[PDB]
């Protein structure tokens, strides 16, 4: 921040707050509350900030530079996409409609359940059409040996997003940073969960308009803090709906429409017999019987391989705690 | 690993032996046979146990057997003391796995780095679960690792949490059980090969007397029997001492065979 006339406080890239009389000819206009200012070699004097910026990490793409995967193959998630349908395209392409309706667009998006996974690959989907940032980020990859790199990332993550906006950011498996802990060795992590708090702080600057889609995923909801689900943070929860007769017959048809299929193949018997348990991971199970064609010397997979995929995964009834009404 | 020929020196078992060749080798040489049918290549493999044993040697054997490029992952030092962020090192290793590709990776002990965070506690668990998140995301890409073959074996396939337990991260299910006495008949040959004695042998004798063992358990005690029999200072020893020693010694060794039966 700039404290008062002609001076201000700044941390270096070594993370120490300073007090310096700023360069005379530029007092304010480009300095701004939050930027990265180049500090004098000897003195660390306040002189000028970045353009801003080329920023630092990631920075975006992953579509034109690959990879990309077509979502249209899997249609069993349609009702799970119903959220993402209304919660992505129009929120980005219209900020004006949210003035007209009288309802504010939420940043809340959740994901959950894996396996069955979906999730990260479903985040690869909308990268086909909507052109924006896509950042692969976890909780544990941006852990550093120094505590101050968090805002050197997440505070830059925000200033690189809204400045390069329209842009979107998905944090894959955010659940790593939600752990409750004390010891001052984690005091850096306490500071990175203060950075999670500092990114919790400065992400609300997205309000209003341009721009973000806050989309979230966790396989376990235990340690997620109330301020992470805070009103105005997660207002929309997606869970994992289990694939079922529609989704099964969809996951039955979508896999075999590519690989060699037979008149021998009737999958309506398998929308019942294996469907009594799974569930799953059927997508890989759909590939498992395909992986059973490599046992040969084969062209079209047999039915004994269909059941072999079902007899390999999974068992059992069972059980001492399960079978007890 | 000596061998290569250690391939034939693991005794059993065919569908453990032969299938892992189709699971690993053929993906390398002929990916066309995958696209001929249209099946996606398996990018990894999984062992488990320990009914019977040999999960570590069969790996160790195939490494110098399958040849090509392979890199072993020592499971210990990853914790890295201060700042256990070293899950990055898997990417740092994966980066050259994308450079040196193709290359292969064996992993023993994925279970203790398979921490549950079931009911969370203290500190050293948090660095664990965080080191897991990258392993997921590395296989959750955003990337194609197909030219690396991830091989996984440990004590039990239980604590790993369901994220690993699905295909992708765990591509196939392979394991070992107690080798059959028919297959143990062969496991003694590769034990009885390097040891020379007087020519009196009945292989099925020890096989019918000594029952329900493992390759190393048999061998080491079979060599221990020769070592117990050479205590008499005489050189060559008939199976007499061995029909006694291996019998009696493994009886003591089967006292601690207790509680070896683990969930799948």
């Amino acid at each position: 921040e700039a404290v008062d006339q002609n001076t201000a406080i700044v941390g270096s890239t070594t993370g120490s707050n300073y007090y310096v009389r700023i360069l005379s000819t530029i007092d304010r206009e480009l300095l701004k509350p939050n930027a990265s200012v180049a500090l004098h070699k000897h003195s660390n004097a306040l002189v000028d900030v970045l353009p801003p910026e080329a920023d630092s990490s990631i920075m975006m793409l992953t579509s034109d530079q690959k990879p990309d995967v077509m979502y249209a193959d899997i249609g069993g998630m349609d009702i799970q996409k119903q959220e993402v349908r209304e919660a992505v395209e129009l929120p980005l392409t219209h900020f004006e409609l949210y003035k007209q309706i009288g309802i504010d667009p939420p940043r809340g998006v959740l994901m959950y359940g894996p396996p069955g996974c979906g999730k990260t690959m479903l985040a690869k989907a909308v990268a086909h059409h909507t052109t924006a940032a896509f950042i692969r980020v976890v909780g544990s990859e941006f852990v550093q040996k120094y505590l101050g790199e968090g805002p050197r990332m997440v505070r830059d993550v925000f200033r690189l997003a809204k400045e390069n906006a329209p842009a979107i950011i998905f944090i894959d498996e955010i659940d790593a940073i939600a752990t409750k802990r004390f010891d001052a060795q984690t005091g850096a992590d306490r500071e990175v969960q203060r950075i999670l708090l500092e990114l919790l702080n400065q992400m609300d600057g997205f309000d209003q308009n341009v721009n973000v889609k806050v989309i979230m995923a966790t396989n376990r909801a235990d340690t997620l803090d109330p301020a992470l689900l805070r009103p105005g943070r997660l207002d929309r929860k997606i869970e994992f709906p289990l694939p079922d007769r529609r989704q099964k017959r969809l996951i039955f048809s979508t896999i075999t429409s590519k690989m060699n299929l037979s008149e021998e193949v009737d999958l309506e018997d398998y929308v019942a017999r294996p469907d009594k348990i799974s569930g799953a991971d059927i997508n890989s199970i759909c590939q498992e019987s395909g992986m059973l064609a490599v046992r040969e010397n084969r062209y079209i997979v047999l039915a004994k391989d269909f059941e072999k995929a079902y007899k390999t995964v999974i068992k059992k009834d069972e059980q001492e705690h399960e079978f007890y009404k | 690993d000596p061998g290569n020929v250690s391939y034939s020196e693991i005794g059993g078992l065919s569908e453990q032996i032969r299938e892992l060749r189709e699971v690993i080798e053929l993906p390398l040489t002929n990916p066309e046979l995958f696209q001929r049918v249209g099946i996606i290549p398996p990018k990894g493999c999984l062992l488990y146990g320990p009914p019977g044993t040999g999960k570590t040697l069969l790996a160790r054997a195939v490494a110098s057997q399958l040849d090509c490029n392979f890199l072993k992952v020592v499971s210990s030092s990853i914790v890295d003391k201060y700042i256990g962020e070293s899950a990055r090192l898997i990417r740092e290793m994966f980066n050259y796995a994308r450079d040196h590709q193709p290359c292969i990776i064996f992993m023993d002990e994925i279970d203790a780095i398979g921490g549950r965070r079931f009911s969370e506690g203290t500190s050293a668990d948090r660095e664990i679960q965080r080191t897991l998140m990258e392993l997921l995301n590395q296989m959750d890409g955003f990337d194609t690792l197909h030219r690396v073959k991830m091989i996984m074996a440990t004590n039990r396939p239980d604590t790993l949490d369901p994220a690993l337990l699905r295909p992708g991260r765990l591509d196939r299910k392979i394991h070992i059980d107690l080798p059959n006495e028919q297959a143990r008949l062969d496991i003694l040959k590769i034990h009885a090969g390097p040891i020379t004695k007087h020519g009196e042998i009945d292989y099925e004798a020890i096989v019918k007397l000594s029952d329900g063992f493992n390759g190393a358990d048999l061998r080491n005690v079979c060599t221990e029997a020769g070592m117990f029999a050479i205590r008499a200072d005489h050189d060559f020893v008939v199976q007499e001492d061995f029909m006694k020693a291996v019998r009696k010694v493994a009886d003591s060794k089967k006292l601690e065979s207790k509680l070896d039966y683990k969930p799948v």
């Binding site: - | 320990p50 570590t56 210990s76 914790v79 203790a112 004590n155 080491n220 221990e224 020769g226």
Partner: protein, 314 residues
């Protein structure tokens, strides 16, 4: 660096690419940033040497009654020390895994060390408190270094203890600290199972009880010899204190059957203390020498329990 930094330098300067692929301890001063010599080796303090001692100051020939089973044990240390030549004929490999156990005593604590006097190779003491780890990966890196310093000083001797401290991994989370340090044992296994180089410097283990640990430890690479040490019997029980009391004078009549017949549950160490309090009243008696009437009193004086009362019967 020692300050964690890293530098990009024209090739050393002074010694050359001759050696090595990156090692430790490469001499450099500050801004000069050139490597003159690579000085061996390794690390660190007592992590380096757990215990380096001359040897036990006495020999096992004093204690007896456990002979035939340690006569089996002393082979495991001596046959790689010497008798491996017997296996060179028929192509056998020496035993690696071995275990020592039973409740005190027994006396392995003295005995498991007492065998190191006849090993003559350098010995290293490992114990549960060593496997207690402030930080993580040390014990692993320690065992990585312990078998460095083992194969480095090979032939050498290493014997461990309190295996039950790290014995169980629990099974299901959450969570154990030694569950990570079990991998040190798993690497100790991976070095004795998945790795060849552990072949030399035979390692022994001991516990107060074998109760619950990782049961898969059965193999030659991991622990093999399991010798149950029972309560010392009247053969040893008469001789143990006889060799413990050979240090001191005796009024030259003592049954030694009296105790040996009446010794029940008495440990070999209790017999060491039987002659103590017997000698303690001999002290406060002002006596010149110890007598059996003074001895046999010390039997029931140390054990058991009481005082309570003597009545109903008297």
């Amino acid at each position: 660096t020692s300050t964690r930094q890293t530098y990009f330098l024209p090739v050393i300067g002074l010694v050359d690419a001759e050696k090595l692929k990156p090692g430790d301890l490469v001499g450099v001063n500050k801004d000069s940033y050139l490597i003159l010599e690579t000085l061996p080796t390794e690390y660190d303090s007592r992590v380096k040497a757990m215990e380096v001692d001359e040897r036990p100051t006495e020999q096992y020939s004093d204690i007896g009654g456990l002979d035939k089973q340690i006569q089996e044990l002393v082979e495991a240390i001596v046959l790689p020390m010497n008798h491996k030549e017997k296996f060179e004929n028929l192509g056998i490999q020496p035993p690696k895994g071995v275990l020592m156990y039973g409740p005190p005593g027994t006396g392995k604590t003295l005995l498991a060390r007492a065998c190191a006097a006849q090993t003559k190779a350098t010995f290293l003491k490992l114990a549960g408190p060593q496997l207690v780890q402030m930080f993580i990966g040390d014990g692993a890196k320690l065992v990585r270094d312990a078998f460095a310093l083992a194969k480095e000083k090979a032939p050498s001797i290493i014997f461990i203890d309190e295996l039950d401290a790290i014995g169980t991994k629990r099974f299901d989370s959450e969570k154990a600290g030694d569950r990570e340090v079990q991998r040190t044992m798993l690497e100790l296994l991976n070095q004795l199972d998945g790795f060849q180089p552990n072949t030399q410097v035979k390692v022994i283990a001991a516990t107060n009880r074998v109760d619950i640990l990782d049961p898969a430890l059965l193999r030659s690479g991991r622990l093999d010899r399991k010798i149950e040490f029972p309560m010392p019997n009247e053969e040893a029980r008469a001789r143990i204190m006889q060799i413990h009391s050979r240090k001191m004078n005796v009024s030259p009549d003592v049954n030694y059957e009296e105790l040996a017949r009446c010794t029940d549950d008495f440990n070999g160490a209790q017999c060491k203390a039987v002659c103590v309090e017997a000698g303690m009243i001999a002290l406060r008696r002002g006596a010149t020498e110890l007598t059996h009437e003074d001895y046999m009193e010390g039997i029931l004086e140390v054990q058991a329990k009481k005082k309570a009362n003597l009545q109903y019967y008297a």
